[PDB]
Amino acid sequence: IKEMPQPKTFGELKNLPLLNTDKPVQALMKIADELGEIFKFEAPGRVTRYLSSQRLIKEACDESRFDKNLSQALKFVRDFFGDGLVTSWTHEKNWKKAHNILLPSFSQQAMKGYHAMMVDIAVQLVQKWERLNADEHIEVPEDMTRLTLDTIGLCGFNYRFNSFYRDQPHPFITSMVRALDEAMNKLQRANPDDPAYDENKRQFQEDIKVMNDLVDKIIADRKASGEQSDDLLTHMLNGKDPETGEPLDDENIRYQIITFLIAGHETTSGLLSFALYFLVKNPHVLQKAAEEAARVLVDPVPSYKQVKQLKYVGMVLNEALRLWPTAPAFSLYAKEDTVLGGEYPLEKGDELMVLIPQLHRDKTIWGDDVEEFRPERFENPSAIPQHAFKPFGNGQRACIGQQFALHEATLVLGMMLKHFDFEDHTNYELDIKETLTLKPEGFVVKAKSKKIPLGG
Ligand code: HEM
Ligand SMILES: C[C@@H](c1ncncc1F)[C@](O)(Cn1cncn1)c1ccc(F)cc1F
């Protein structure tokens, strides 16, 4: 029954120039602040409706009426991730097949089995910071990415990236980032000329080969191994579908490996980085979290059971995900003609985009203090209405890695708070870099050891 707001248009380009910025999600949040709970965004040949209120998003999350959509971003990265779990349609046969095969790799029982290898990498992080000299500082997102990449490599695939042995990032992730940048930049401007893009397109082939060589090696080293593994790669290679009784095909396996290597570390690094940012900006909250870590983590290394008792650290992480969910949007399509919210008619196939940071600032849900960092909002999880808090997506297409991410992040943040005091020595000004995920660029701290020993 109502007509939808729309931001500024530019002739035949429609709204597209508004995203000529390196911070498009933050630009869309500002449009949502100006225009409200829903607005229409048009580009040449596509329309998207952006949702920001829990009132409308709770309906969008009704899986009888809306299914996951492959947004323009997911259609773009499908060039690399193929029909892996993140980039396949719900009704593409390999989605449910791979979901069925890999679900058991993300249970609590699987988490108990990953714990010792998560501790392996977390101890390496703590030892790096213990070994810094006087007046040296920490590049926070850089070291969080070292940890999370190593953790998914070791836990998932028994592969050691050995990121803490490197002063620059592992070539695999440099090659991935550079291949994606090149693929993006290429979508514009006189492409077959003298240099083209890659110094005549050679660097992309090299970067593609880096990624294919690593996938080759992860698979070959497993098959040649005379040790028993039971990890994510075991299920990828050998798990049979409970429905059809067949394993994943070889091509899809390659896509799942690169999907999980990337999905399994990037957003978790961003979460750890934002959580430490908010802690040093809210020293009362840091103190409360540090007291919990000291009281709970009484052993030289944490046990799985002790990580489960880091209740306040978990609330800290959820509140960082509330303010800056590091995968900040997900996309849905209308299965049939329908009316959203009693007021906005949709046609079959219409795209809805959930603007998660704005959902998480809905004052009718959280109160007027939405910009404050207050972990106590999560003291009682049953008090949060359904579909108010969605940093991991929705329904059967929600993040399969959610518990892995939160166990890793709770473990590591707990050990950080046990072993160091933290100083915001530069009075860092939050600068949020946007790729397909969010991170606090240039965030640096100093860590003063509490001199607490690590069986590390
Ligand atoms: C705090 C960290 C993380 C956040 C915020 C996050 C966020 C998300 C979101 C929002 C989705 C839904 C995407 C969509 O609807 O298009 C998703 C799906 C997915 N995530 Fe994550 N994720 C995190 C960590 C992880 C980890 C650690 C892994 C792997 C170990 C992972 C693997 C996946 C996969 C495979 C899917 C697709 C699930 C499916 O459709 O079957 N994510 N994640
Ligand atoms: C969105 C993000 C993600 N999704 C879900 N859980 C964690 C994440 F970290 C991402 O890593 C983004 N990304 C894309 N190319 C580089 N990075 C991603 C990973 C794999 C993928 F198949 C698609 C995809 F969008």
Residue numbers in the entry: 2 to 457
Copied sentences from the primary study:
Among the bacterial P450s, one of the best characterized enzymes is the Bacillus megaterium CYP102A1 (P450 BM3), which Armand Fulco’s group identified as a fatty acid hydroxylase that could catalyze the hydroxylation of saturated fatty acid substrates, primarily at the ω-1, ω-2, and ω-3 positions. P450 BM3 (BM3) is a natural fusion of a cytochrome P450 (N-terminal) to a FAD-, FMN- and NADP(H)-binding cytochrome P450 reductase (CPR). More recent work in our group has used the double mutant (DM) form of the flavocytochrome P450 BM3 enzyme (F87V/A82F), in which the first mutation expands available substrate binding space in the active site, while the second mutation is more distant from the heme but causes a structural readjustment in the P450 that alters its conformational state. We also report the first structures of the BM3 DM heme domain in complex with four different azole drugs, confirming the greater plasticity of this variant and its ability to structurally adapt to bind to several azole drug compounds.
Surprisingly, voriconazole coordinates the heme iron through a pyrimidine nitrogen from its 5-fluoropyrimidine ring. All other voriconazole-bound P450 crystal structures on the PDB show coordination of the P450 heme iron through a triazole nitrogen, and thus this is a unique binding mode for voriconazole. A novel DM heme iron ligation occurs for voriconazole, through a pyrimidine nitrogen on the voriconazole 5-fluoropyrimidine ring. One of the few direct polar interactions observed between the protein and one of the azole ligands is made between the triazole moiety of voriconazole and Glu267. In the case of voriconazole, it was clear the 2 R,3R-stereoisomer was bound, while for tioconazole the R-tioconazole was identified as the bound stereoisomer. Similarly, small mother liquor-derived compounds are present in the case of tioconazole (a molecule of 1,2-ethanediol) and voriconazole (a molecule of glycerol). The voriconazole, clotrimazole and tioconazole structures contain multiple monomers in the asymmetric unit, and in each case the general protein conformation corresponds to the “open”, substrate-free conformation of the enzyme, with little significant difference in protein or ligand conformation between monomers. For all the azole-bound structures reported in this study, the hetero-aromatic nitrogen ligand is oriented so as to fit within the groove of the I-helix formed between Ala264 and Glu267/Thr268.
